[PDB]
Structure formats: structure tokens, C-alpha cells
Design a protein around this ligand. Structure first.
Ligand code: 6R0
Length: 279
């Protein structure tokens, strides 16, 4: 079960939803398309409060969280629905997202290859649990992979999760599978998106960068296949412990995940198997 918070409780613990960033002495941690994330303090314990700015995504997040409890899934502590505002309270992840850590945001040291392998395994275990419980994430990306006090990967944002076609195409363009951009809902789309995440882990480069050539990361797969370059040329230079064999092993998994034809992609159980064999 989850704790039922009144809107006034979350108003006070976030210092009246202090929209200034943490760095300037505020409570704002960041923002997405569905809401602003604030740092909160409840009984000497730190929390993450997402104020939604939509009701179906609130209900879906609570529904999926109540059904799915796992080491590699972020934990929901509570919620608020009494006001005209909808809030979701989560366990605070001291090491933020995988995207922020790969970009060494706010002076954090680069993640070692060893830590990156454990994160990839953890994230695959998280997706596996969701698929075993007949749930499709629909928005797998490095920004949706959180890191706890031990750098354990925790898949987040189950607002777009589904228990097939759609008229409302949702997700992050740079990570989305071709059929997902076409309106299809399949667990194979989650596999493709995980393949993009694996490329981000190897390269330390975001999936999309408008001031970069090529703009999209999944295009490096084409340069490697056409023998124009190798994965060795793209290995994150911010690592000192990356070995050619295990990097090529993770790239092989990423390449299999990134097959344009959804039926040629491996299932999450096979992805999990190949990532364990890698280490
Ligand atoms: C502008 N920026 C900054 O000032 C710094 C930097 C951080 N930003 C993100 C903001 C949201 C955050 N999320 C969480 N951080 C800690 N503990 C958590 N527990 C549960 C969550 C989520 C919240 C959303 O719903 C799903 C569960 C969470 C991840 C980092 C990225 C951009 C950068």
C-alpha cells in the first residue's frame, strides 16, 4: 500500500513548491512534459515529489507501482489527489538519472565500465520484471533510468505503461522503435529503446544532439555495419577500464536490439542472458 498525502503536507515539505533549482537553494530538481520534480523532506527522510502539470497517467503510475515491486524499479511511497493538483511521492535517488551521470552533470566523476555493466544488467532485470507482469513501459530511455545510493539501476516513469494500435503516439523520438513512431504498442519496442540506452552507455553520448554530426546516436550502427568506423572509435574516452571484448559483447546485444524488424529483435529474457554472459 501507498501513503495518502494531503496537498498541504507536500506544499510545506517542498518549501511551498520552491521552483528555483537545488543549486540556487530551491527545491526544483527538474521538469518533464507531464510535471515538475521537487526535493522534499518527510521526517528527516528525503523524497522526490512530482507535481503533475494527466489523470490517466497518475492512475496508471499508481496501478503499475502497486502490481510491480522489484529491486530495479523505482519505489512509489505515496500520492496526493485532494487538491486540483496531482502529486506522486517517490524514494529519493541520490545519484539522479543515468543520462545525467553519463554527461558528468554538476561535477560528478565519469561512470566506470564495471559500473556501466552493472547498470545495464540492472535495467534489463527491471524491464524483464515489467514484461513478465504483462506491462509495456513505452518510454525506455537513460533519463528514465535512476541511480540509488549503490548506483543500482531503477526504471522510472510508468505513466505511459500499458497492460495493438494507438491514435496518440507517445514517447521520446530519439529512442522510439520505427513501429512505435507508426502507432504500434508492443513489448518489442521497449527492446529497441533499450538498444539505444546500451549505445549511450558505451559511447557516453546522448541519443540526440542537434549540434552533432550525426545528430542521432542509432546512426553510428550504420557507420559500423558499412565498415566506415568500429565500436572502438566510439567508446567513451571518459573511461579507463573498458576492455574491447566486453564492449563488443554489449554492442552485439545493442545491435540485436536495434533490428528494424521487431520480430528479429531478441526478447528481454535473451537480452538479460547475453548481458550476464558479457561479465
Ligand atoms: C535540470 N536539471 C537539474 O537541475 C539537475 C538535473 C536532474 N534532472 C532530473 C530531475 C528528475 C530526477 N528524478 C528523481 N530524482 C531523484 N529521486 C527520484 N525518485 C523518483 C524520481 C522520478 C521523478 C519523476 O517521476 C518518476 C520518478 C526521482 C532525475 C534527474 C535532469 C536534468 C537536470
Amino acid at each position: 500500500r501507498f501513503h495518502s498525502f494531503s496537498f498541504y503536507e507536500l506544499k510545506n515539505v517542498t518549501n511551498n513548491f520552491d521552483e528555483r533549482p537545488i543549486s540556487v537553494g530551491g527545491n526544483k530538481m527538474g521538469e518533464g512534459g507531464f510535471g515538475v520534480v521537487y526535493k522534499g523532506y518527510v521526517n528527516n527522510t528525503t523524497v522526490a515529489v512530482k507535481k503533475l502539470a494527466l489523470k490517466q497517467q497518475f492512475d496508471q503510475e499508481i496501478k503499475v507501482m502497486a502490481k510491480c515491486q522489484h529491486e530495479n524499479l523505482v519505489e512509489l511511497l505515496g500520492f496526493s489527489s485532494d487538491g486540483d493538483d496531482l502529486c506522486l511521492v517517490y524514494v529519493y535517488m541520490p545519484n539522479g538519472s543515468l543520462l545525467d551521470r553519463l554527461s558528468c552533470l554538476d561535477g560528478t566523476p565519469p561512470l566506470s565500465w564495471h559500473m556501466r555493466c552493472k547498470i545495464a544488467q540492472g535495467a534489463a532485470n527491471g524491464i524483464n520484471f515489467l514484461h513478465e507482469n504483462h506491462h509495456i513501459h513505452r518510454d525506455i530511455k537513460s533519463a528514465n533510468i535512476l541511480l540509488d545510493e549503490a548506483f543500482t539501476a531503477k526504471i522510472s516513469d510508468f505513466g505511459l505503461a500499458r497492460a495493438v494500435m494507438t491514435s496518440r503516439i507517445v514517447g521520446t523520438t530519439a529512442y522510439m522503435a520505427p513501429e512505435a513512431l507508426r502507432g504500434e504498442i508492443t513489448p518489442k519496442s521497449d527492446i529497441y529503446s533499450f538498444g539505444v540506452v546500451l549505445l549511450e552507455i558505451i559511447t557516453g553520448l546522448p541519443a540526440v544532439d542537434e549540434h552533432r554530426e550525426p545528430q542521432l546516436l542509432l546512426d553510428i550502427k550504420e557507420e559500423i555495419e558499412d565498415e566506415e568506423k568500429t565500436i572502438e572509435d566510439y567508446i567513451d574516452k571518459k573511461m579507463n577500464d573498458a576492455d574491447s571484448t566486453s564492449v563488443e559483447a554489449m554492442y552485439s546485444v545493442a545491435s540485436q536490439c536495434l533490428h528494424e524488424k521487431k520480430n528479429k529483435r531478441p526478447d528481454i529474457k535473451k537480452v538479460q542472458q547475453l548481458l550476464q554472459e558479457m561479465t
